[PDB]
């Protein structure tokens, strides 16, 4: 109150959320194609097979183990909520600034 003011950011939180949702939807529905040019749809298992080829594993490995891979991914994405909620110091980098 002594000449100190805080200015609002240009982008509201809802706009940031919309940007992240657009990025997520593009990644899910088109792979990496929406970053180079026009977005091209591709089924998600085929995109995952492409990623497996990228890391040097042949693509029939994913098709033979699709259910196990999906279950492992679901469990791993479930665990992170508890992992970040249980530890107070998980989000310390923002709290320090």
């Amino acid at each position: 109150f002594n000449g100190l003011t805080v200015l609002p950011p240009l982008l509201t939180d809802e706009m940031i959320a919309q940007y992240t949702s657009a990025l997520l939807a593009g990644t899910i529905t088109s792979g990496w194609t929406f970053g180079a040019g026009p977005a091209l749809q591709i089924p998600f298992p085929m995109q995952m097979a492409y990623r497996f080829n990228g890391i040097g594993v042949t693509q029939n490995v994913l098709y033979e183990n699709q259910k196990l891979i999906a279950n492992q991914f679901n469990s791993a994405i479930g665990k992170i909520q508890d992992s970040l909620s249980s530890t107070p110091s998980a989000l310390g980098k923002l709290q320090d600034v």
Binding site: W32, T33, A36, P43, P45, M46, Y50, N60, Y63, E64
Partner: protein, 146 residues
């Protein structure tokens, strides 16, 4: 006090300029002296080559990139079951125009006849979900019969 303020501000600005110059040196090493695979580092699209151009107190890069233009709808299949065996493409994707099936490379439409040198056989066709159901050709057999 005035001189000290000027010197401090100059130091901070020099640090910023040094960061920019380090980035420029990295871009010269990786985009101009080679072909880069990092996404969006050397322009928008698939990087082909770059050309430097001197400017006063700076540099300018001209990034030549590859951009896909006209796309079409097709139907896919993860694999092909022919004689109880599942066929997967060596490099490419199985594609159909409504009646026949072909193999094309992923980044450009170039249909090919499905043969034994386009695909590899792995396992049986009872495990793959959504496998499609066709004929593959071995060019050795017609030559042997003739």
């Amino acid at each position: 006090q005035s001189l000290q303020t000027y010197v401090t501000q100059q130091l901070i600005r020099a640090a910023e300029i040094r960061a920019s110059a380090n980035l420029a040196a990295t871009k010269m090493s990786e985009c101009v002296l080679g072909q880069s695979k990092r996404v969006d580092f050397c322009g928008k699209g698939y990087h082909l080559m770059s050309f430097p151009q001197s400017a006063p107190h700076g540099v300018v890069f001209l990034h030549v990139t590859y951009v896909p233009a006209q796309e079409k709808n097709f139907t896919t299949a993860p694999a092909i079951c022919h004689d109880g065996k599942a066929h997967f493409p060596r490099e490419g994707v199985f594609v159909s125009n409504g009646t026949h099936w072909f193999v094309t490379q992923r980044n450009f439409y170039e249909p090919q006849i499905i043969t034994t040198d386009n695909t590899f056989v792995s396992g049986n066709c009872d495990v793959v979900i959504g496998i499609v159901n066709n004929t593959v050709y071995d060019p050795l057999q017609p030559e042997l019969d003739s």
